[PDB]
Amino acid sequence: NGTSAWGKPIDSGPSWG
Amino acid sequence: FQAPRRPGIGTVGKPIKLLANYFEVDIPKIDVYHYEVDIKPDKCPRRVNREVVEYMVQHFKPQIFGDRKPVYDGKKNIYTVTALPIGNERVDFEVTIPGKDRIFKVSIKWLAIVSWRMLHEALVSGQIPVPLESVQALDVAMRHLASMRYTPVGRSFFSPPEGYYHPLGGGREVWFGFHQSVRPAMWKMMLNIDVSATAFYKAQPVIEFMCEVLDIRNQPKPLTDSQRVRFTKEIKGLKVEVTHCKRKYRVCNVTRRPASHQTFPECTVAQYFKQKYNLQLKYPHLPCLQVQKHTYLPLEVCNIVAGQRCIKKLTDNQTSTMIKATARSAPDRQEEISRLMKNASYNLDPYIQEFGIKVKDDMTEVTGRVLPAPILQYGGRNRAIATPNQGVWDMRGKQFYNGIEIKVWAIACFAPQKQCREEVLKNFTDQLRKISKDAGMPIQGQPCFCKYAQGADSVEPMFRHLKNTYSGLQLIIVILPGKTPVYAEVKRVGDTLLGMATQCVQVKNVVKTSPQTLSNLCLKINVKLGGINNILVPHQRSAVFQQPVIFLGADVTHPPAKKPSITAVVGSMDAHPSRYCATVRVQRPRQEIIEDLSYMVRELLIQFYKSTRFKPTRIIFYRDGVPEGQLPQILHYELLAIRDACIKLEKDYQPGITYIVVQKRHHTRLFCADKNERIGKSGNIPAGTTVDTNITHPFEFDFYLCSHAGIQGTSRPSHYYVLWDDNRFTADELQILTYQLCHTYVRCTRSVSIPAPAYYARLVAFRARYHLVDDPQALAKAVQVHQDTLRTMYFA
RNA sequence: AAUAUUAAAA
């Protein structure tokens, strides 16, 4: 499921959205 | 924008000896002389222009030309082996050509030298670009004779059927011919020959043409308003020839008035044809053809003139019946292309000998590689894997990687209950429920709703009702009685209006249920509900998956011969990659560029960031539906559009872009050199066969990959052309990845002919047309998808 | 609309 495991979800950038 | 050069030759895969329908062409290191032609009147068909240039090279040899054999392209380009005795100034001719005689005024002016020595150097050293002027002059010469003896349609040539007859109904028949193109290939220019086939209008009386268009065995009645219009939409613009006198006319309209009533300068057409030619019409109740000057011809003195290709779209019966008349096994196409070459005898062509061109007799041999198939990871209790065999695998013993537990669902039947009684509905759901649990997608409850409906006008009130009555509703199963306007209205209401997952099944497949058909239904259903069927085994993927990467597919579909063109760009929303989100637009008809690409990419990048909380460091862009010739203009716009989207998202966000054109519309055909390696009744090449030598570009990054198994006919290997690569792929890395993306297509446990991203964009663009079924702002609104549905793969 | 492939695109 994960869709991740690139690791390191990062809180250091503009949030786009 | 300079296309990236080939980084290297691929190395992975079992070797396979192959034959390609390319033929080596040898040209001398000489200059050829290029003159521009002006013909007045200047808007004549190319078949007429060739009669003009032919007459004057026949009738003006002492003054100019002499013993030269010039070659002509039907328009303004004409090429000679030695330069005509002319300066830089124009030379005018007065030409009269024999029906009746037409006078033409022709002008020739020198233009430039075209160097075939230069074309040699680009194929050996690559230090200059392939001179298109040299390639164009070579193609004109090699096809000049065929252009005088056959009927050119595009790059093909056809002749009227002799002996055979492949009728399509509706006044259309099938003509067989061949394709001929000249491209450069690493080790020489290559002549590309293939069998071709297209539809033509039957050379038959207009009365017979009218009957086939309207379905009638001739019980006299006039034409109804519905019949007059449908007959007009079919014959308007076509050409007819008269039999009472032998002239030819273009039809511009069909009179709203019968032949006995239609008048003109006062006098009816019926009386005029009595008052002369002493003809008493057998069908004066039928209309006349208008050929605005007021000249009208009754249908019975007109025949449809042969040689008119049919550009209009064919019905479902007409495409199905043409597919059967043209599909041959791969060995059959081999011997047919071989027959055409022997018949052509290009080395004995007087024009080909004029320019010293030599054509190789036999099909080019090249050794390709059968890439190894990726392994698909499934989930469920077993966590089984799938080993593709011949580009095919099955669900036996496997459950979905993420199975959706279906708790609430409804059934809407649109076939009459006489055809689909309650007893056969119960058997259908029972079989589907069992197979769905096997696949790990438990359809647990019985339908919270199950009614019979009739008409397309009932779907919205019923679907509005379902969304309000049943909380937590996941799926509506819609049973349909064949082709119906209900399907579009189901998709319009579901996808765009209410945001509700829907799975349409034909009533024919409900009465008789195949477990394979039920399994293929669940593949769509589980994904329509936000599930994952399988994933590529992760550790066998390319290194681009070590950092956030997004995969995009793109396609443009054009309206048949004012409907708009539809562009679609899909984006991977995960790292597997399995889930894709879709964007779609409408634009002016027959614009090949995706005008709204910049904002469509922006939306996909934002959705990717919401689904993963990652920003892509790389963008892999597979572009489908590209015509050659407009390729530089398309890439220039679209590559800057992708970059512009990244610039507008962050101040310093510069991900690497790989731009790949996927071309399935071409006449490059590959064959097994060893007969023992032919696969299936069709005898095609194995799935995974790759070629990036011998027939590909001299120094640019392209390859052929036939990723699918050929069921019928001759397989079309997909051509992939890398137009931009910031990510600096190797040949192996990109060929394997393209092949692995061909195994991530959710609608079947098969390896398909193009990557899943490009295929999804195609599905999205086709679904947009059902959304446009009954103002550009209103057209743009009709293809907008409900906010609940943007987040899912509705297009499956 | 189970699905892929196949041909076209007066």
Side-chain angles (χ1 to χ4, degrees), chain B residues 91 180 322 461 729:
Chain B
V91 176
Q180 175 177 321
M322 182 178 205
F729 280 97

Short mmCIF file of all heavy atoms in Angstrom, two decimals, chain B residues 91 180 322 461 729:
data_model
loop_
_atom_site.label_atom_id
_atom_site.label_comp_id
_atom_site.label_asym_id
_atom_site.label_seq_id
_atom_site.Cartn_x
_atom_site.Cartn_y
_atom_site.Cartn_z
N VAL B 91 11.24 30.20 -66.13
CA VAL B 91 10.92 29.73 -67.47
C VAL B 91 9.45 29.33 -67.50
O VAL B 91 9.03 28.48 -66.71
CB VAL B 91 11.81 28.54 -67.89
CG1 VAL B 91 11.37 28.01 -69.25
CG2 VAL B 91 13.27 28.95 -67.94
N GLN B 180 5.02 2.84 -48.79
CA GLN B 180 6.41 3.05 -49.19
C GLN B 180 6.92 4.33 -48.55
O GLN B 180 6.36 5.41 -48.79
CB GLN B 180 6.55 3.12 -50.71
CG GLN B 180 7.96 3.47 -51.17
CD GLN B 180 8.11 3.46 -52.68
OE1 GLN B 180 7.55 2.61 -53.37
NE2 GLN B 180 8.88 4.41 -53.20
N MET B 322 -13.74 -5.08 -41.92
CA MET B 322 -12.49 -4.75 -42.60
C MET B 322 -11.29 -5.38 -41.90
O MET B 322 -10.33 -5.78 -42.57
CB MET B 322 -12.31 -3.23 -42.68
CG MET B 322 -11.06 -2.83 -43.43
SD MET B 322 -10.84 -1.06 -43.61
CE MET B 322 -9.83 -1.05 -45.08
N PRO B 461 -32.23 10.52 -12.16
CA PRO B 461 -33.10 10.44 -10.98
C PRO B 461 -32.82 9.21 -10.12
O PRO B 461 -32.87 9.30 -8.89
CB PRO B 461 -34.51 10.41 -11.58
CG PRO B 461 -34.36 11.04 -12.91
CD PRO B 461 -33.02 10.61 -13.40
N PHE B 729 19.37 8.43 -18.89
CA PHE B 729 19.13 7.00 -18.90
C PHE B 729 20.17 6.27 -19.74
O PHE B 729 20.68 6.80 -20.73
CB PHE B 729 17.74 6.68 -19.46
CG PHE B 729 16.62 6.86 -18.48
CD1 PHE B 729 15.88 8.03 -18.47
CD2 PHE B 729 16.30 5.85 -17.59
CE1 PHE B 729 14.84 8.20 -17.58
CE2 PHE B 729 15.26 6.01 -16.70
CZ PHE B 729 14.53 7.19 -16.69
#
